[PDB]
Symmetry: C4
């Protein structure tokens, strides 16, 4: 039996403006943050808005390392405003035997998206 497990998460990051124009429907995320959380470019992600309770799913794309960028682009902009605090999570599947000991990758933040 195959389980769906938390692969990784960005724990309480803030939505920023986008430094560059990104395609609608995606969330652009500083590559440093993707590296820490194990989240891949083009991976399905869930975004849970702690500020307003909204929950939606999209996919990740890399923003430049150091940009600290969390940009919800396009249709997704209907669900998150600049300054909102969100959780970004990806999930993976694996057999039950492996899932029993699985440890997700978590990145924690302080200040203006400064990674602890």
């Amino acid at each position: 039996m195959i389980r769906t497990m938390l692969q990784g998460k960005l724990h309480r990051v803030k939505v920023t403006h986008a430094d560059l124009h990104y395609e609608a429907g995606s969330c652009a995320i500083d590559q440093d943050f993707l590296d820490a959380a194990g989240i891949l470019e083009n991976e399905a992600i869930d975004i849970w808005n702690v500020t307003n309770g909204k929950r939606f799913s999209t996919y990740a794309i890399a923003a430049e390392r150091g940009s600290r960028i969390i940009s919800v682009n396009g249709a997704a902009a209907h669900c998150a405003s600049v300054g909102d605090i969100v959780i970004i999570a990806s999930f993976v599947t694996m057999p039950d035997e492996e899932a029993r000991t699985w440890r997700p990758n978590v990145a924690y933040f302080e200040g203006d998206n400064e990674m602890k």
Copy 2:
């Protein structure tokens, strides 16, 4: 049989358990659940779960974390506290995938609750 069609099946659920705690302030995302309850429903730490709030009709998905055995805690944390409040009655389910022949004889792990989150 390689290439067999794979089903998504109810693995287990906590049926009509009561929310005991709900905090916007950070154990953010998760629902923390008494480990005895997780055991009964076959739900794992860090497993994706669906929560159906029977009280207010909201439906959301998150992941499970273990609370202390015997605490009888159901704590909806972070963003999820916008979807459930202390006192609300919820159903917490996990789903697994398996081939069709297995799915046709699968029995979910169900825990039923009454009163002070007493497992029946």
Copy 3:
């Protein structure tokens, strides 16, 4: 690469009252309808409400053959009223090579949930 494909659907059935009391969070469906659509007891299903546009997911349980029952129980009752027309669908995964020729199971209805 593994594709997610429509396994089967009940095409435009009506939500009924429940003949018996069913557990909250589920949808009870006449076993004849499950048989035609290939939908299993305890299988995840999507319900799309044609009447009011609401969309949600739950799991299937068998109602008695011949009962014609489509009962959305409990929390799910917030999303479908008796007389609403819905589509009920299940999805399966399989490799791309098989998915290219995959055919879903579809049941069509007339009158008061009378299966064509």
Copy 4:
């Protein structure tokens, strides 16, 4: 490597295509899409798809069916017509699963659109 962790990845998408038809009256559920567009995005008939409506912010999931090659049709059928209207700009995506090493080098199939659903 048996037991490898499996990722959910964007397989392909139709980026900013325009809805041409929307009917509550029964081709119910699906979104019918010009087969040329399906080919470009690697999307299959009967494949699950996510639709993000850029015009109204609605997000829903359904499955794809093929419309006639060269018709340039995007028809949102049945319940889905409550989520999109003729003229609305949408993104239609499919997701697949694959092991992690494959996912790390995966390139999605993307089709971009302008004007009269002209594929760029």
